[PDB]
Design a protein around this ligand. Structure first.
Ligand SMILES: O=C1N=C(Nc2ccccc2)N=C1Cc1ccc2c(c1)OCO2
Lengths: 9, 273
């Protein structure tokens, strides 16, 4: 299953 | 002068947080991280006791950078015509917690306890200092792999701590609480506790529990890995849909799952070395 980063700023 | 004081190395990363490079301070070869932020992207500005007008991030870092802690400290900063440059500590060897969990999968509870405990102490420190980070997540935690110490980074979405409502937010949505999703309103500590529940689930399950807004506001926590009943209880308490039903930092640290934490050094020897 896909794990990803999630942007902020 | 900025350019004669630091030797610049490779790019460590870039994104909403600017562009960050590895560097070494020429005076004593101390390892550093060098963060560049374009002025046009700084929406939130503060002022130092100096009276100097600076990005909020510089104000927050200076407030948390006194003494020792689990926050990556601001060593110095500079203003350029179109940008600010921040000189930050750089532990060596380091891996961020996002990459650590990707590579290692779901963490043994003893390791998650030690990490989570250190994050709690760091966040307490920020709050003691009048600082709310507002973007607590695995990506914003660095592990010093030799000392077994965790360090918070990237205060660019943060704020001065207050007791009244926040109606703005620039952090990571999948770590944001349901009252933000539903109402565009949150209170600082209670929103921090929710993001800590997301983080703890991330640690013991290997990924965050929610991706979609409807999952965030549903507050059904499905456990995809074997997690102890005591740990599930803590996570679910942190992820209470009503902010006033979430534990205080004190209640988190007094939780039975949190007792008998490893020291940083034991953590490195047992789990990291
Ligand atoms: O304050 C910071 N903000 C950072 N942001 C960042 C840097 C690279 C990718 C994503 C975010 N990095 C640091 C400091 C830092 C400190 C030690 C390091 C490091 C970065 O990269 C690897 O070792």
């Amino acid at each position: 299953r896909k794990r990803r980063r999630h942007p902020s700023g | 002068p900025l350019e004669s004081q630091y030797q610049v190395g490779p790019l460590l990363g870039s994104g909403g947080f600017g562009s960050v490079y590895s560097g070494i301070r020429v005076s004593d070869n101390l390892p550093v991280a060098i963060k560049h932020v374009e002025k046009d992207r700084i929406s939130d500005w503060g002022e130092l006791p100096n009276g100097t007008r600076v990005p909020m991030e510089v104000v927050l870092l200076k407030k948390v950078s006194s003494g020792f802690s689990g926050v990556i400290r601001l060593l110095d900063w500079f203003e350029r015509p179109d940008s600010f440059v921040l000189i930050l500590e750089r532990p060596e060897p380091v891996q961020d917690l996002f990459d650590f969990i990707t590579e290692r999968g779901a963490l043994q509870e003893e390791l998650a306890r030690s990490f989570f405990w250190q994050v709690l102490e760091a966040v307490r420190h920020c709050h003691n200092c009048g600082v709310l980070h507002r973007d607590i997540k695995d990506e914003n935690i660095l592990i010093d792999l030799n000392r077994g110490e965790l360090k918070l980074i990237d205060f660019g979405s943060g704020a001065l701590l207050k007791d009244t409502v926040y109606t703005d937010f620039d952090g990571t949505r999948v770590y944001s609480p349901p009252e933000w999703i539903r109402y565009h309103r949150y209170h600082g500590r209670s929103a921090a506790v929710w993001s800590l529940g997301i983080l703890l689930y991330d640690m013991v399950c290997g990924d965050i529990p929610f991706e979609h807004d409807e999952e965030i506001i549903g507050g059904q926590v499905f456990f995809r890995q074997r997690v102890s009943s005591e740990c599930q209880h803590l996570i679910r308490w942190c992820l209470a849909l009503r902010p006033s039903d979430r534990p205080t930092f004190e209640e988190i640290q007094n939780h039975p799952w949190m007792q008998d934490v490893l020291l940083p050094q034991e953590t490195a020897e047992i789990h990291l070395h």
